[PDB]
């Protein structure tokens, strides 16, 4: 099995997260994270 | 000017109650391998004996500040069956009354995971709230 590096995109602005994911894909990656610009809790979507 | 005019630079406030009431006092942030958390100015303590219900308020010094116990002839003669949930409501609002008279509106309570579900304690806390006494101690200023 392998580990995939994925780049998450925020709904608003240029904020971008970088995190690791599993080959088998136990839990598909969708987050609630922190955006600096609006100073908010956000929904981050898995991207490349 | 006046013979009373003099004040002097650094003022002595000699009562131990002061800094605590100002919220600028110390707690002991610490322990934390142990239980319960010893960070507080005033800790509500409820001991349930197989016979009597006793409720205390304590200072970190161990001193018992204000208490309501059943073996007290006052509460003893006024009601029935010491171990009752009713008697816990009673001791609750007696300690509420006595707390306001002592002018302490803030103390912390750390019940046990199993204790927190019993009726006696929920009614202790309701008696306390209706009494006007706030649990969950106010934070420290510049901790």
């Amino acid at each position: 099995s392998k580990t995939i590096l994925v780049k998450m995109m925020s709904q608003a602005g240029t904020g971008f997260s970088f995190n690791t994911k599993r080959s088998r894909l136990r839990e598909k990656l969708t987050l609630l994270h922190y955006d600096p610009v609006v100073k908010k809790k956000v929904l981050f979507v898995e991207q490349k | 000017p006046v013979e009373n005019e003099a004040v002097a630079p650094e003022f002595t406030n000699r009562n131990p109650r002061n800094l605590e009431l100002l919220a600028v006092a110390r707690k002991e942030r610490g322990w934390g391998t142990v239980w319960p958390s010893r960070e507080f100015w005033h800790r509500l303590r409820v001991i349930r004996t197989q016979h009597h219900i006793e409720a205390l308020v304590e200072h970190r010094n161990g001193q018992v500040v204000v208490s309501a116990s059943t073996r007290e002839w006052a509460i003893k003669k006024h009601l029935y069956s010491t171990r009752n949930v009713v008697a816990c409501e009673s001791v609750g609002r007696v300690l509420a009354e006595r707390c306001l008279e002592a002018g302490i509106n803030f103390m912390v309570y750390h019940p046990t995971p199993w204790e927190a579900a019993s009726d006696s304690i929920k009614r202790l806390q309701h008696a306390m709230t209706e009494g006007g006494v706030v649990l969950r101690e106010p934070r420290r200023i510049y901790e």
Binding site: L5, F18, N19, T20 | -
Partner: protein
């Protein structure tokens, strides 16, 4: 380091020191922290913060970096808007 050049007979400077370091006029040298752009998804928030920071070098280093730099980089500089200009003087130092 070239202690005497061919054409001018002067003393040359090592440019690789000029690209990674900064000399304040106090004599303190100021450098980035190694590996701060490297493999971020592995590291903790703590380590990332520690890596983004600038830091100061011990006497042994500042001394060495000074030998690789000519008079021109030890010069006093007033730039318009200079961020570090507030950091170039030493204050309250009782040795």
């Amino acid at each position: 380091v070239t202690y005497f050049s061919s054409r001018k007979g002067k003393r040359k400077t090592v440019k690789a020191v000029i690209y990674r370091f900064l000399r304040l006029h106090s004599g303190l040298w100021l450098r980035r922290k190694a590996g701060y752009k490297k493999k971020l998804w592995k590291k903790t928030a703590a380590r990332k913060r520690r890596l983004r920071e600038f830091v100061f070098c011990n006497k042994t280093q500042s001394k060495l970096l000074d030998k690789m730099t000519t008079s021109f980089w030890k010069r006093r500089n007033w730039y318009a808007d200079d961020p570090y200009q507030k950091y170039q003087d030493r204050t309250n130092l009782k040795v």
